Amino acid sequence: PTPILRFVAVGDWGGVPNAPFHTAREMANAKAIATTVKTLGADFILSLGDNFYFTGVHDAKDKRFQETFEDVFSDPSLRNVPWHVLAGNHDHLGNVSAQIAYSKISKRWNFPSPYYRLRFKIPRSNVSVAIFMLDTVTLCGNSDDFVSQQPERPRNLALARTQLAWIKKQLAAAKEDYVLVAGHYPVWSIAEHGPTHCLVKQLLPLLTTHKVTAYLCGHDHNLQYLQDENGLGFVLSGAGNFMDPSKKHLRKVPNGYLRFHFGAENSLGGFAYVEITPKEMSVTYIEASGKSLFKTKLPRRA
Ligand SMILES: *[C@@H]1O[C@H](CO)[C@@H](O[C@@H]2O[C@H](CO)[C@@H](O)[C@H](O)[C@H]2NC(C)=O)[C@H](O)[C@H]1NC(C)=O
Numbered sequence: 022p023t024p025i026l027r028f029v030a031v032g033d034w035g036g037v038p039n040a041p042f043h044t045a046r047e048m049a050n051a052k053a054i055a056t057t058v059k060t061l062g063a064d065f066i067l068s069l070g071d072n073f074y075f076t077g078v079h080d081a082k083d084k085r086f087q088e089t090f091e092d093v094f095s096d097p098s099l100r101n102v103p104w105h106v107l108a109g110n111h112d113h114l115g116n117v118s119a120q121i122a123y124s125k126i127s128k129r130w131n132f133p134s135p136y137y138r139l140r141f142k143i144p145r146s147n148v149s150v151a152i153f154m155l156d157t158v159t160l161c162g163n164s165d166d167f168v169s170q171q172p173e174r175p176r177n178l179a180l181a182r183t184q185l186a187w188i189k190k191q192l193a194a195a196k197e198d199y200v201l202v203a204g205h206y207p208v209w210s211i212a213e214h215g216p217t218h219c220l221v222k223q224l225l226p227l228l229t230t231h232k233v234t235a236y237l238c239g240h241d242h243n244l245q246y247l248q249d250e251n252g253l254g255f256v257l258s259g260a261g262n263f264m265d266p267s268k269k270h271l272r273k274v275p276n277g278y279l280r281f282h283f284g285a286e287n288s289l290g291g292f293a294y295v296e297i298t299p300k301e302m303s304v305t306y307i308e309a310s311g312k313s314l315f316k317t318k319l320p321r322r323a
Contacts, residue, residue: 032239077115
């Protein structure tokens, strides 16, 4: 059997603050993800931010952890599937330290710090994968802090410079066969929010220089796949709770980069299913309805 590492990448699934604390879309995606894990399998699930709408959690004991997360992703197939989490802007309007601290309460919730590195060894093989989970809010600023709803500047300068330096160092030293970087804010996006200037300027150069396989993100509520002339992939998966068909920033993304987009208003949303083997990295976009909408693959690093 071909060695393989599999995981679900879902973003902006944070339900709602008012009863019942979830949306029809979040429930649909919970079911859809449970079906995919049940039939295709998944080693873990990656959350791309905006875990609890609209102002995160107050503390590690916030009832929202059970109402919006635990109780929602409760289907049998998801019982013991680990989640590796990072924060979004809405999470930062609340207590992120609380989401980090919740890791000690719920076994499947993994969120050791604002930004961290994940390392995986594809089973029955020597090919490795590294995933760098970033906190784009502390790095660029909280979009919610500005009327423009864009991260115009970080709240703390030392924190932002410190993370970037860490990214630079790590990406330079990374030797894995596959290197993924994940953050809430998008580098490229044709939707409502569009490209995050802070990431295009500070992160993208790094992604390129160090031949990262792909950048995974959420924030814009839809599904997109973009790839630049160097083959760098951009997996945007932020439709776990909402679906916005906005193409406002279509012209703000370099010509030809957009390879796939789905943001139908009537859709219940969707997510991305990543499969990594010694041969390649495949990314399948699946609608909450269970249907595959698009699939592509990325090569391993030299
Ligand atoms: C953010 O959340 C953290 C974690 O829930 C809060 O810190 C806890 O506060 C209790 C108060 O009784 C302490 O006994 C715990 O030791 C703290 N836990 C940790 C992990 O530090 C914190 O108060 C919250 N901050 C804000 C501003 O709401």
